[PDB]
């Protein structure tokens, strides 16, 4: 009921200032039920979006520079990938390495460490999801996730 208390709440208790908790030095809020099941399905390797679908999704990016990205597949038909659109969602130029929950433990030893057959081993570079399926481990409330590194 005063400008002083309003400024206090706006500078101390606002939700974005509350993303990381001092209790366990990690995010306290993360991506949750539908958005998490769907981002897992969306960042799978075989998710291909058509031009109209991509424009529909870009309508819902607030932080979009208005430039349609070059599709990952140009021929025989232009197709964007879910990782290619989440790369637009990912802010700044953050860099992050995670592993999808189904990541086999004997894959980081053998070959294909940097080209994962299962599309596990999340790698975000310069704010582009170079590879990997996003999940709780990448967008949840754990330490070192994309939301934490973004904050």
């Amino acid at each position: 009921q005063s400008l002083e208390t309003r400024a206090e709440i706006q500078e101390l208790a606002m939700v974005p200032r509350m993303i990381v908790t001092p209790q366990s030095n990690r995010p306290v809020m993360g991506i949750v039920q539908d958005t998490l099941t769907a981002v897992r399905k969306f960042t799978k390797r075989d998710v291909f979006l058509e031009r109209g679908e991509v424009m529909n999704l870009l309508m819902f990016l607030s932080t979009w520079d208005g430039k349609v990205p070059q599709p990952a597949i140009l021929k025989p038909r232009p197709l964007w990938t879910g990782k290619q659109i989440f790369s637009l969602i990912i802010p700044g130029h953050i860099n992050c390495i995670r592993t999808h929950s189904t990541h086999p433990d004997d894959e980081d030893s053998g070959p294909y460490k940097h080209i994962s057959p299962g599309d596990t081993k999340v790698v975000v570079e310069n704010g582009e999801l170079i590879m990997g399926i996003l999940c709780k481990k990448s967008l949840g409330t754990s330490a070192g996730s994309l939301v934490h590194i973004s904050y």
Binding site: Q1, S2, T5, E8, I9, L12
Partner: protein, 62 residues
């Protein structure tokens, strides 16, 4: 039975109790919501001293 219209409630300078001049209790009494001990502790952790004083002094019983 739990419909929202029987639960929604708001207050801005309504009636107060007789003994301690604080907001009444309940929707039916047009009462205010309790800013309890745990809310006090939360706002102490926040460090919001003026908001804490507003809730526990100025919005209750100056």
């Amino acid at each position: 039975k739990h419909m929202v219209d029987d639960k929604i409630h708001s207050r801005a300078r309504g009636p107060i109790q007789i003994l301690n001049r604080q907001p009444m209790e309940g929707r039916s009494r047009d009462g205010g919501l309790r800013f309890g001990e745990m809310e006090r502790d939360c706002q102490i952790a926040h460090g919001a001293a003026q908001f804490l004083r507003e809730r526990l002094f100025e919005a209750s019983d100056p």
